[PDB]
Design a protein around this nucleic acid. Sequence first.
DNA 1: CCCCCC
Lengths: 232, 308, 73, 317
Amino acid sequence: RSSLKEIEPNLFADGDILEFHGPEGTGKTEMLYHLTARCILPKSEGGLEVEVLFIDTDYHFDMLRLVTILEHRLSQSSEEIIKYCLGRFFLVYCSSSTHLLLTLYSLESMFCSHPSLCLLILDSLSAFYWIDRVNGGESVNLQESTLRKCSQCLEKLVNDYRLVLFATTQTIMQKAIDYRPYLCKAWQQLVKHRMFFSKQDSNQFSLVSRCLKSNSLKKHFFIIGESGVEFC
Amino acid sequence: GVLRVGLCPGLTEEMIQLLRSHRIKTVVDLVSADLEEVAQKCGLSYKALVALRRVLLAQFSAFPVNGADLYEELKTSTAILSTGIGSLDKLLDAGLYTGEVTEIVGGPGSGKTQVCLCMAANVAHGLQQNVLYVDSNGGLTASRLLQLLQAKTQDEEEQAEALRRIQVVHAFDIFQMLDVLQELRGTVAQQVSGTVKVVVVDSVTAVVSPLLGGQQREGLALMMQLARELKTLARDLGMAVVVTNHITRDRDSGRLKPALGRSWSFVPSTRILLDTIEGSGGRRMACLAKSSRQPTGFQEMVDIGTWG
Amino acid sequence: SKKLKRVGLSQELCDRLSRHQILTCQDFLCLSPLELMKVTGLSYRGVHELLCMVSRACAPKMQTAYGIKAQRS
Amino acid sequence: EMQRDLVSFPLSPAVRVKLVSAGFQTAEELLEVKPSELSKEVGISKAEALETLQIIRREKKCTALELLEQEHTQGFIITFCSALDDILGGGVPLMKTTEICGAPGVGKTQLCMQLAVDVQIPECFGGVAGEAVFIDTEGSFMVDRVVDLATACIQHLQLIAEKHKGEEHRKALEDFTLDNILSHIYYFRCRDYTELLAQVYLLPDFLSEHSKVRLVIVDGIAFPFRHDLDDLSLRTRLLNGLAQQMISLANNHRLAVILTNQMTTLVPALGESWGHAATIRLIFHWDRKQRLATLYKSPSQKECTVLFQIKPQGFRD
DNA sequence: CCCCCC
Ligand SMILES: Nc1ncnc2c1ncn2[C@@H]1O[C@H](COP(=O)(O)OP(=O)(O)NP(=O)(O)O)[C@@H](O)[C@H]1O
Ligand SMILES: Nc1ncnc2c1ncn2[C@@H]1O[C@H](COP(=O)(O)OP(=O)(O)NP(=O)(O)O)[C@@H](O)[C@H]1O
Ligand SMILES: Nc1ncnc2c1ncn2[C@@H]1O[C@H](COP(=O)(O)OP(=O)(O)NP(=O)(O)O)[C@@H](O)[C@H]1O
């Protein structure tokens, strides 16, 4: 299927799992919108015309925002064309990590059905961390067991259908590169690139893409406007 | 969840007993485990287990709604519920949005309670829609709502009707608030009569703050469960949730930020930070501290004296 | 202050509290009921009963103002 | 059909962990579970099984119109100062938490005694005809002063009653005597902040026993925490918890919760976050040796500074 | 081991 370089040229100078990590209002969901637009806009406009699945474990997917971004990306925007472009987009709502696991196991049966769905946004994987870590008790194995099962199902899905998994992890800890890992080690091993977000005081945003297999850091600067994400 | 009679059609008690005896207690264990080996070591039919798994994923998992269908359904089911404040509407691009968690961050006497009261008065009277006010710090005074409605209109029957639209529920710790929100979710499920369209929770931070602190992370979990309830109310039940949050200064940068920490900072879809003028009491600067469809940091002036 | 051994606490619960360095009324009341839920087990309904139990041993006794009037005379 | 997560219910953390390890993520899957079955499957004790079943099966919706009618019937505690009554909406409100902030020696305790006197004022005289609960932490509750205030209030009620020419007023004042007023003030002396927390925990039971109490006063919430408590995070947690307890008590038992607070260097003490605690905030401050009361925060009246004074008759304008 | 906290 499609390559990672064409998904967004600036981040990727080169079946991957990528993580977006950063505080609120740093553009993680907006970068996800930009990738969604680059994947669902038609070939005529300049998009890949491939279906994108978005998992709201956090319930912040603004449909109006995605439609605004699309309408601005098109040279000429119309209701019918926007509906066609959104027909490629799919949304799943997950209320709990158990609900996320069941949704993933059912999503296998739609990934088998849809060959063109190449990208899988999961916003945000950490949304059920705290809950998972209290009802599992003090035993680290129990508390992250369900999220470990979600991580294993995610790697199975991204390996079988060659999906590009763009996960968003909310930075919730300070670590006494602002990144303290907190998810299960069964998820960390899957991540290929970690992209850390920040905002400069507020239109300018800094992204740091660290490749784990090479531990290589690349710096990007981008802005968000009514168009979407524009890389400087 | 666990396997019980009536959970899904086609199961029987001896099936549940055999699954329990074969280290399969829950739906996740039923569907994650290999069907062939449990079928061969259990005596259950392979086709029966396949059908059981299929119906379990059909019931307990969330079907992926198409983007176009969702877009056309929220083009009508959503609503830009006007705050009743012109300048705050212009800051929020005509006001609230149904289906989002809106957080009115501010300090003491910052106007978050007053903004929520004007919101409830305008929704109950202007749009004739019911409001739920989950009072947690005692801020809601029905006299102030009556004053707002009198400012809006001078018809006594209209004011009385609008006051009857606003339903006041008091919840002062996290468990009362969660019970209230879950009762509202059940009420809306039964209703789907004038349903509740705005859920004002003033304030989340008042009931969440006692949970935080110390060597316990169940405070973070209760905060996140409250967030899940608010977001299910907002998105799944399609009603505008307006929580109010306190404001705190980070002890590393000296910058104002929403309370309840980083974990809660991701919770509201929209966030309005209200603060006082450094150089009148009524006038307050309103910033879009967080948003999903509008640039962050836009400043507007809201004068509480203009309504009331 | 007053140690929980003589408040009326059960021996197993006294041991559980002592394992977390909880010995006096100050050590007990200063924690949120959710922290007490974590350390002692029990429910929020079940820990408010215990908080009332410890408070009754180390809370002020009610004194009507007429009582102060009688005492001062 | 809605599903209520066990993390939301006030179940025991160990019991919740064991219930979700057994696989109970939502409480709906336990309503039809027998307690014996629950204990045999999960592994919790019989008492814990009964308690968790009770909790899961346990879980007022008064409209704002009914709330307004309650506010009208549940009269405000008249402050005897016309200015504060006007800017407090008729006096100290029931079902609300007022915070009298101010520097030492400005008249917070005098206001507390005045309100403790004015709660026992009969309903036909504009009062609420209830008892008062005083929680003095600073050791400044002077019984002679509250006796003098009660005498002055009794004289004022006599004057207005004999201006009205009503037998009902005389009958209602018959039981409004000095001995009844001083026997209707339940005074607690919380030596330190743990005593205060314990008394606040015992207040719901005390008021369920004493159902006619309408006012609870905390004469000094800054004193027990600014002293003998060197942890700021612990102070914040305790203050947030106690504020929630006070507002819950006021609304559940139809009370007015007064909270007196000291000034720090200008700004009310106990941190800026504590300003979110009380519903109303009145700073009492000095200007050219004259007393001004400022309504810093109030969800019903605009910020405004009014004139008041302390006289032998009590708390006057 | 981070969590929150002016
Ligand atoms: N049309 C727009 N023009 C300019 N800026 C915008 C626009 N829409 C959104 N933004 C800003 O761009 C950023 C995008 O926010 P967002 O991508 O949701 O952050 P986030 O990392 O997802 N935080 P969270 O939702 O909690 O995960 C925010 O700072 C918005 O204020
Ligand atoms: N009727 C009114 N007319 C004008 N201004 C008013 C009126 N009622 C309240 N205000 C203003 O509102 C301020 C308090 O706002 P309020 O919204 O109650 O504070 P809050 O921060 O939202 N609640 P809290 O959580 O305790 O901080 C007062 O100081 C007044 O300036
Ligand atoms: N009988 C009286 N006649 C006239 N003035 C009085 C009388 N009693 C007290 N005052 C005045 O009223 C004020 C008393 O204030 P007070 O109520 O004690 O404040 P306070 O809250 O107790 N200070 P603090 O204890 O530090 O919080 C002082 O200005 C006294 O001079």
